[PDB]
Design a protein around this ligand. Structure first.
Ligand SMILES: Cn1nnc(-c2ccc3c(c2)[nH]c2nc(Cc4ccccc4)nc(N[C@H]4CC[C@H](N)CC4)c23)n1
Ligand SMILES: [Zn+2]
Lengths: 366, 473, 394
């Protein structure tokens, strides 16, 4: 089907500070891989418009947005009592042109959601957004603005019920918090639980009140491999959309889930990770693929080109083209990665118990 | 025991104690039923055939087949018999050699192993050759290795010991079999040893490696020390990671630090180059987790530590050096953070920290819990430490030295379940064990380092980072 | 201390007691040596040892210190098993030679056996032989057995030995149709518990009714246990309102209607069975935590000390895990669950005992003064005699 790609050229020039894990340069890597891979021609490439703060504040509190608009590396000594209540400063560091990047990230995500909103296209691959951790009141994670919330909020104007599948290692607590109460959004995250960063996802926690039986979280242990992931992923989404029947899916492809990650304990293959996309593609609904958490920039690039190829339904070879970033990839220089062996503490009885419990957590869904 | 109301077997768990405490109270307090008289150096002792035969397998062979012995001395015999009757004896350094030989000759293994371990713990370069020869004669494996190891570490100084010259070829070859680093110049002493093929055909040079790493000054710098010459330390490395280290462990001759922004990564300095390597990042978001290096498993363990939610974590995860993978293991009995961690021949001890109080608080902790590496199981010691809180434990030989807040310094021995108070000269201190000595470092200096030996409890001052956040053994 | 491990310290061999105990075991009976004494009982001769006999018995010490010696009133069998007990430490008790062993082990100074036979003679007391046991506990210095004989003499006083009973014993028997007998003389709900005839029962897990009203629970819990310690009703374990296993314990003083908080169990369990044994609380299995997100049937034993306020897990595991229901008959707890496999647990000794049950539903075991009553969840009232292991329908 028709595919829409959103990427601003000057999005890899937003250095997060020395030593920080999240590097937006990975967004350029994918877009530099796509051109040399013979995929740019087949896909409708757009340019994301800087989202206005008045449009950005459709979910976030106005004071938070103004605080983001004013914070600068220099004008910071005075801005000292605001960083200690907005969680900015230490884990979510300030950098030159922070708000400009905060508008580029939300830009393509809302433009894409507008394009599927108008029933004009089918897939919108925004590899620049996907920041799923910025809470309503204040920043969290590595994010500052939760572009995902604006994307869903745009879809909700016309579409009645909307899905959001997240396959990032983390829980994506921001989105869940934004749609705990409401029944119009069905969030399903496949995170890792137990002394991990979000710490909120648990089998016992569901959307409160009107969101009862919706926020389906699947806790996991470290080292879950492709075969287990495939065996678990399909029979849950095929039941969620069989009792929810969402009009549109917002699927986020975190690149932490891959093996060899800097901040991830999973063990995955690009085929295994980018099989969630060939799964959802067979349901033939408007689909919005976002980027997101990825910290092995080399594997993030390798991963994100492949689902882009899957969305086009194209077939692509392992030999990497001689791009600008060719020297970065491994000595084999191939696309697909092999999983370094690590024990899978997701024992079959463990996953089967969770799968069953989730199954009655959706059989009660109206 | 078919039916409790009709017929069953009745077992007394207190019977063994009833007999053991009914033996002291009679055979010693009020001498009765003394069938046999045994005299040592003309000092008769009224002894029972039954007790001595029931404990010793050597006296029984004599009773079944007024006895007078020759090798044993009266004083050593008195406490030996008071051990057979009581079970508790006061071991003394001066006369332990005789206890070793006599107890082995009497097949009293318990008081033979405990002096095969007393000897193995107080062995020094002055008497290393003599004890190694004695262990060879008495066929003791653990003491033999613990004496050859000391000889091989200090082989350079032993070149003029007058016993190295007068040694059988088998012992010299076994000494030069392994270790013996090039700093000791094995070839020079081996040449004078003849004054000759096996000695030169098998002399593996280990090569001296840096054994002490200080982390401090906060551009935090990691300096390296190597005790050389006599009772002196030197410097051989000023590596600076330029990051924020929050935990560290020394495995082998390598310094596995952890830290940086989002302190979940890893590094490693071989000390042979300023080029840091990259290891698998820690798969957990935990801080104040102790790092224990187990060389007998080629692993590094992370135990305890706080979560990001201010809840204590009782999770243990190890890291294979070869496979470069972090794997989960059995959880601890109770959750701790900041607890000193020491590995003693496979058993990892977690000493103190901040245990979870009943009222959602972190009280200073005094527990001693040990997790066995081989059985992979963890259990709590019934007794507790005298001081609770932050402390820096360093294994030395078979016992653990623990310096907490204050100036007191205990000497915990795990097998005996007993402590030994030692007073440091008059600030939270830090200790380690280079070579065969103990070094104690002041937290902030602006004397800095004191070298002490537990024998005589003497603290000699020995002689630049303002801050010393981490010191590794 | 003042003991340098590198200079001078004392070594305590924790294996000395066992070493000598087994040395006696091996070198005394298996092979006879160093006998130095000979004791004759009813013709039979035992080649004993002076030291062991005088070690744990002061009758053979006060009687040895102050060749063949003959005893006066002991059977050749009973004395032989006594010798085994003084030598091995594990004897096989039998109900036929019980009355004799009590006296012979009392006139000898073997206290542990004296208490053992006292417990045996107190858990097997029958109303027919109650008065004789009372006389036995009167001649010998046994208060506990005396009270146990008093109970069966009092709770069955309506029904030879009583005809000629002295007034001295009768006064104690009557202290705790009495006049007619004495005429002859010598001429929904989550948890609940029964506290001396008060059927306390636990809307929300906070209400208590006796109907009547009582103080509410300081915690909302489900599948929490409840005991009847005579001096408060204790609540342990349970499942929280957030579907997480509970770990807290609270008293309930009958006098002052307040629930005090106390020490927490070492292992948080749910649906466990509770049994009070003379001031020590026993929790029986339950639904332990599994996979950090669910539960599993459990076989664990929790000993909680009420007087000292401590908790501890014994290493032994129950024969059958899962939900269980237990009762206290006498000096021990009888445990049953679905499966018709009754077990008996005697906390003092380290041993269970299995027993067959009719095939016939989750069973519900009780413990009356008379005997045991095992009910069925669907199958009528039963009464089984543990001595014979035979069940009789009501
Ligand atoms: C999507 N995503 N990718 N990566 C992360 C992420 C984000 C943050 C952290 C993190 C990972 N690992 C971390 N480890 C530590 C070390 C530690 C552990 C336990 C207890 C105390 C400290 N502290 C972190 N932050 C603090 C929070 C409080 C603030 N005052 C200072 C910075 C973080 N999220
Ligand atoms: Zn992520």
């Amino acid at each position: 089907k028709k595919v829409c790609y959103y990427y601003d050229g000057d999005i890899g020039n937003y250095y997060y500070g020395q030593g920080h894990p999240m590097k937006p340069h990975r967004i350029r890597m994918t877009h530099n891989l796509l051109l040399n891979y013979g995929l740019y021609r087949k896909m409708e490439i757009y340019r994301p418009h800087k989202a206005t703060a008045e449009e950005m504040t459709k979910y976030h509190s106005d004071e938070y947005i103004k605080f983001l608009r004013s914070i600068r590396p220099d004008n910071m000594s005075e801005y000292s009592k605001q960083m200690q209540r907005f969680n900015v400063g230490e884990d979510c560091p300030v950098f030159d042109g922070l708000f400009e990047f905060c508008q580029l990230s939300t830009g393509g995500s809302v433009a894409g959601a507008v394009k599927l909103n108008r029933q004009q296209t089918d897939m919108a691959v925004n590899w620049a957004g996907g920041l799923h951790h910025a809470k309503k009141s204040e920043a969290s994670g590595f994010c500052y603005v939760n572009d995902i919330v604006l994307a869903i909020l745009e879809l909700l104007k016309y579409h009645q019920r909307v899905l959001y599948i997240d396959i990032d290692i983390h829980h994506g607590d921001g989105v869940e918090e934004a749609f705990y109460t409401t029944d119009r959004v069905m969030t399903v995250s496949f995170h890792k639980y137990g002394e991990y960063f979000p710490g909120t996802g648990d089998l016992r926690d569901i959307g409160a009140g009107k969101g009862k039986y919706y926020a389906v979280n699947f806790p996991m242990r470290d080292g879950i491999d492709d075969e287990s992931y495939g065996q678990i992923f399909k029979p849950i989404i095929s039941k969620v959309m069989e009792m929810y029947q969402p009009s549109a899916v917002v699927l986020q492809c975190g690149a932490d889930s891959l093996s060899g990650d800097r901040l991830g304990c999973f063990n995955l293959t690009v085929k295994g990770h980018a099989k969630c996309v060939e799964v959802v593609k067979t349901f033939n609904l408007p689909l919005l693929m976002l980027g997101g958490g990825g910290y092995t920039i080399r594997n993030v690039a390798r991963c994100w080109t492949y689902e882009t190829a899957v969305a086009l339904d194209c077939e692509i070879p392992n030999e990497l083209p001689y791009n600008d970033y060719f020297e970065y990839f491994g000595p084999d220089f191939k696309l697909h990665i092999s999983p370094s062996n690590m024990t899978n503490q997701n024992t079959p009885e463990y996953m089967e118990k969770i799968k069953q419990r989730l199954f009655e957590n959706l059989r009660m869904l109206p | 025991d078919e039916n409790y109301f009709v017929n069953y077997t009745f077992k007394d768990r207190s019977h063994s104690g009833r007999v053991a405490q009914g033996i002291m109270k009679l055979c010693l307090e009020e001498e009765l039923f003394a069938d046999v008289t045994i005299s040592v150096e003309g000092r008769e002792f009224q002894l029972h055939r039954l007790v001595l035969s029931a404990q010793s397998c050597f006296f029984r062979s004599m009773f079944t087949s007024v006895i007078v012995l020759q090798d044993v001395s009266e004083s050593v015999f008195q406490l030996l018999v008071d051990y057979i009757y009581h079970g508790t004896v006061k071991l003394r350094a001066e006369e332990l050699q005789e206890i070793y030989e006599v107890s082995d000759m009497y097949q009293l293994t318990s008081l033979f192993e405990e002096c095969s371990r007393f000897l193995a713990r107080t062995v020094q370069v002055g008497n290393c050759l003599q004890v190694m020869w004695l262990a060879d004669r008495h066929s003791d494996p653990e003491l033999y290795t613990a004496a050859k190891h000391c000889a091989k570490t200090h082989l350079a100084q032993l070149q003029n010991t007058e016993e190295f010259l007068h040694l059988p070829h088998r012992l010299l070859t076994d000494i030069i079999s392994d270790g013996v680093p090039c700093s000791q110049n094995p070839t020079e002493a081996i040449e004078a040893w003849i004054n000759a093929e096996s000695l030169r055909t098998s002399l593996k040079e280990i090569g001296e490696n840096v054994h002490i790493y200080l982390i401090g000054k906060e551009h935090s710098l990691a300096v390296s020390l190597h005790c050389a010459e006599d009772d002196s330390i030197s410097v051989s490395g000023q590596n600076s990671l330029c990051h924020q280290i929050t935990a560290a462990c020394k495995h082998g001759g390598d310094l596995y630090v952890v830290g940086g922004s989002i302190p979940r990564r890893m590094w490693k300095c071989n000390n042979a180059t300023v080029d840091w390597e990259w290891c698998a990042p820690l798969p957990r978001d935990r801080l104040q987790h102790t790092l224990v290096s187990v060389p007998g498993k080629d692993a590094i363990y992370s135990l305890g530590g706080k979560t990001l939610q201010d809840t204590l974590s009782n999770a243990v995860i190890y890291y294979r050096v070869g496979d470069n993978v972090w794997t989960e293991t059995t959880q601890l009995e109770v959750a701790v953070s900041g607890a000193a961690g020491a590995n003693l021949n496979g058993i990892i001890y977690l000493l103190g920290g901040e245990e979870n109080d009943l009222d959602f608080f972190t009280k200073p902790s005094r527990l001693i819990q040990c997790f066995d590496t081989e059985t992979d199981k963890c259990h709590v010691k019934p007794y507790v430490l005298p001081f609770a809180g932050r402390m820096h434990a360093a294994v030395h030989k078979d016992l653990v030295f623990i310096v907490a807040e204050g100036d007191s310094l205990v000497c915990y021995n795990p097998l005996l379940d007993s402590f030994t108070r030692l007073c440091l000269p008059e600030s939270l201190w830090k200790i380690a064990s280079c070579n065969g000595s103990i070094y104690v470092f002041r937290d902030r200096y602006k004397a800095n380092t004191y070298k002490l030996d537990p024998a005589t409890s003497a603290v000699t001052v020995t002689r630049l980072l303002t801050n010393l956040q981490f010191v590794l053994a």
